[PDB]
Design a protein that fits this description.
This protein has 1009 residues and is of the alpha+beta class. The chain is 43% helix and 16% strand. The protein has six domains: 74 residues, no CATH class; 56 residues, no CATH class; 134 residues, Calcium-transporting ATPase, cytoplasmic transduction domain A (Distorted Sandwich); 223 residues, no CATH class; 194 residues, Rossmann fold, CATH 3.40.50; 179 residues, Calcium-transporting ATPase, cytoplasmic domain N (3-Layer(aba) Sandwich). The longest helix is centred in the last third of the chain and has 39 residues. Keywords: Acetylation, ATP-binding, Endoplasmic reticulum, Glycoprotein, Magnesium, Membrane, Metal-binding, Nucleotide-binding, Phosphoprotein, Protein transport, Translocase, Transmembrane, Transmembrane helix, Transport.
Amino acid sequence: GHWSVHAHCALTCTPEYDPSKATFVKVVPTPNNGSTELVALHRNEGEDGLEVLSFEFQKIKYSYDALEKKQFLPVAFPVGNAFSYYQSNRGFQEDSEIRAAEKKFGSNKAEMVVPDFSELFKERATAPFFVFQVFCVGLWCLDEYWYYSVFTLSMLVAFEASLVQQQMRNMSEIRKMGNKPHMIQVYRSRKWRPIASDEIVPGDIVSIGRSPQENLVPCDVLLLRGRCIVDEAMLTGESVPQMKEPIEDLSPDRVLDLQADSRLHVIFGGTKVVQHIPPQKATTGLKPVDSGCVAYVLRTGFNTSQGKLLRTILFGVKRVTANNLETFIFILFLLVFAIAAAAYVWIEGTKDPSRNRYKLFLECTLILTSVVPPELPIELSLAVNTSLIALAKLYMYCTEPFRIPFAGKVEVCCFNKTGTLTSDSLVVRGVAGLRDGKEVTPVSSIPVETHRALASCHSLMQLDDGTLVGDPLEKAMLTAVDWTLTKDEKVFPRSIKTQGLKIHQRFHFASALKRMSVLASYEKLGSTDLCYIAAVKGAPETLHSMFSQCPPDYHHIHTEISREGARVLALGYKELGHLTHQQAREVKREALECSLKFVGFIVVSCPLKADSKAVIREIQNASHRVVMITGDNPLTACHVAQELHFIEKAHTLILQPPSEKGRQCEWRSIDGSIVLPLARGSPKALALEYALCLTGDGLAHLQATDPQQLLRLIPHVQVFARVAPKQKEFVITSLKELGYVTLMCGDGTNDVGALKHADVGVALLAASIAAPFTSKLSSIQCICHVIKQGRCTLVTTLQMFKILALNALILAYSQSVLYLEGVKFSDFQATLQGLLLAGCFLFISRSKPLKTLSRERPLPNIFNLYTILTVMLQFFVHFLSLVYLYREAQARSPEKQEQFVDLYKEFEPSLVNSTVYIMAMAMQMATFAINYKGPPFMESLPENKPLVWSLAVSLLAIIGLLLGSSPDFNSQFGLVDIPVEFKLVIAQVLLLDFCLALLADRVLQFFLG
C-alpha cells in the first residue's frame, strides 16, 4: 500500500532535486504515524519580491525558509512572541497584509469535506490483501470453479463493505464536534468589523463573550483585558469550571509559555465561556462595543488543541491495522504446510507424463492461494470492532480504538484518589487547630478572622441564575461560614454584623505551588481608609515556612487529624498594614506568601464511593496490581488505601527525605512502630514484610541522586503520596519503560499530563477527548468493564487464528489428495462448504463474555508454545484421518478405465470424492467445537445458542449425507451411494479422530496451563 504510492509518482513524473521549480515533493511520513503522500507545491507572488515555497500535509502546512536554515519549516505562530507585544498591539491596520497573513499562516478552516462511501471504499480496495484476494478469485475462475469464485468475491465485498461502513460511522462523531461558521465581531484596520469565523487569522483582535446561543470559542484566544469564567469540561474532563485572567496586569518582562500559562490566561478553542467580567472603564485601551473581553488570537485551524484532537480522531490513530508481525508469522507458518502440500501435488502430477502440466502448475497455485488469505485481514479488526460496539453500550466511549487490545495485558492499574475513590459530595467537619488538641471547634466559636479568611480565600463565582459553582473544597468552605457571595464580588454575612470584603485579585491553584492566595480589603471602622488583608490556603506542609508564627503542636495536630482520613488544609491571614491603590495591584502575588499568621486548619469529610472497594478487590483477584497516585498527605492516602485494601499488609511505611544533607532516607510507618533505612539490596523483602509508600519529596530526592533505585522501587510501591502532575507522568513513564502495561484512571487537569502518556488511560466525568477512553458514568466499574472487554477481544483473536489455521490446512490437504487422485470438488460442493464456513464464523464472532473476570491471564497473542503446538498436533491427528480414509477408498475403489480426460467432464462422482468431502466438513466442525476457549473467559458453548444451532445443522447435514437417507439429496450434490460396510468405518475413524483431537488439545492445555 504505502510502498505502492511511489509507483504512480515515478510513472507520472520524474522527481526533482533542484529547488528551482519542483513540480512535486515527496513527503516523509515519519515512523510514528502518517502515510507517504504527494503534495504539489504552490507558487505565490511575494508583495516584497520574495518567493515562498510551501505545501499542505495532513492538513498541516509547512513552508520553505532558506534565509537562515535553508530548509522547509512548519509555519511559525505568534505563540513565541514577547509578552510586551500583545499589550500595545492594536490589531491589523491594513488589508494587503491581511491577505498576506491569511495566505502565510493559514485560514481558520478546520472543516473537512465529507468522505463518501465510494471514496473510502476505493481507498480501501487497493490494500495488498484485497488485491491478492481478487487475484486468487481470478485463479479459481481459471480453474472453472465458477460458483466458489462468486461466493468468495461476494464475501470479500461484504466484509470490506462492513468495515467501510463502520469507518463511516466515525463521521457522526467528526461532525458531532460541531465547529461551524458563524458571525463574529472582530477588530481590524482601526475599526470594529464583524468578520467571518473561518477567515480569522493569527494576530487579529476579537471581542469574545457569552453568546445568547451558548456558542463556542472559535479559535484559541489570549485574554487581553478582563476576567472571565470558563468551563473546560468538554476538553479537560473537569466538572469544575476554571478561571482565566487578563494579561494587562502581568509584567512585560515575563516570557509567555502555554505549558506554564495555559490554565490562567488563554481560552482554548471550542470551550464554554459562560460569564465575562468586562474590564473597568477607567483603564485606557481597546474599547469593545459588545462589552466582551478583548482577546488576541494565537492559533487557528488544526493548530489548536481541539483541532489537534480531531486530527487524532481522523488520522492520528493507528487505525487498528491488521498488518502485524503476528499476521506475517501466521501466514508464513501456514504457507509452509500449504507449499509442502502443493509441492507433493506437483511431484505426483509430474510423475505422470500424460497429464497436462499447465493445469498441474495451476493446481499448485490454487492450493497456495486457497490456504493462506481466507478471512485473516478481517479478524483483528472485527474483534476490536465487536468489543467497541459492546463497550459503547455501557455508556463508556473510546476515541482511539487500537488501545483495546492493549487493555488485555494491563499488569498494573493506577488510580487517582481525589477522583473515583474520594467521591463527589464533601461535607466540611469544621475548623481545627484553634483549640488545644485535635478537637474541631464549631463554626460558631471560631474567630471572625477565620470567617473572613475562609470566605475570601476562594475561587467561586456567581452566575445570572444565581447558582454558586466551583471546587467542592470551596463549596463546603463557603457553606460552613454560610456567608453569601454576591454578583458584585462582595461577600455579605447572613447573621454577622461585619463589613463586607471586596476581592481584588484572585491567585489561583498552582499545583506545583500546592497553594492559593487571596487579596481582599476591608474598610476600617470609623474611617474611609482601605486595609488590605491577605488570606491564603494550601497544603500545610508547604505553608509551614510561610507562617511567621507557628504553634508548637503544628506537626502533631496535623498527623493526628490526618490519620482519621479527613483531608486537612491549612489557612493564613496577614494584616499587611495599609496599602494605597498603585501597589494594590503592583505588589506582586509572590510577595503575599511570606510572613504569614496562622488562623486554623480545615478538614472536609471525604467519603468513599462504595463501588470502589468491590472493584479493587475484583481487580486484585484478577492477577493485577493496584497502585494509587495522588497529591495528598501520605497518611490520608495510606488510610484510604487500607480501607479499600490497596495495601493488605499489617504495617504501612512511608519514606521521608532527610532534612540534613548527607543523611540517608529512612522508612517510617504511620504509627512509628518500625523505622528502617533503605538498603542497597532488593526491595522484595520489604515489599513482602509490609506495604510501601514513597512521597514526592523523596521522589525528587531519589530522582536527583540515584535514578536506578527509584526505577527498581516504583513497581513495589502501592501508595504514591504528594505527587504533582509532572511527577505523576514520570511515575507512569517509569512503570511503562520497565515493561508493565499501565492503566491510569484520573480526571483532573493534573491527570491530562499522565493519561496521554500511559499505555491505556481512562478519564472520568463527574463525551470528551482528554484521554483515549472516557466514560460519562462517574463510577469506577468502567476499569473492570474495559479489562474484561480487552481480554474478550484477545481471546477471540487467538481462537480465530487457531481456527482458521487448522481449517485452511485441512481444506488444503483435502484438495491436495483429491488432485493426486485426479478428482476435484465440484463447484457446488466447495460453494456449500465455504457457505457453512461463513455461517459459523459470522456466528462465532457475535459472542458474549462472562460477567466476572477470572484469575487466569489470557494469552497476549499467538506467540506462545500453546498455539503452534496445538495447531500442529490437531492437524496431525486430522491429517492421519485424511490419509487413512483416502487409502481405504483408493484400495477399495475400482480402477480408472481411460487414460484420456474430457475437458467438459468435471467433478465426475466418485467414492473418494465423497469420503474426503464428508470427512472434510466433519473435521471443520470438529475444530470449531474443540478450539472454543470457553470458561473462564468466554461463555459456555451451549449458552452460545446460534453457534450451537449452526454446528447442529452442519452435523445433521453430514449425518444425512453419510447415511444418504434421501437419494435425491446426494444426487444433487453428486455423491455416490456408499455400501454400509464402508459407512461404518468412515463414522468410526471420524469419531475417533474427533475424540483423540479433543484429548490432545486438552492435555496440551493442562500440561501448559
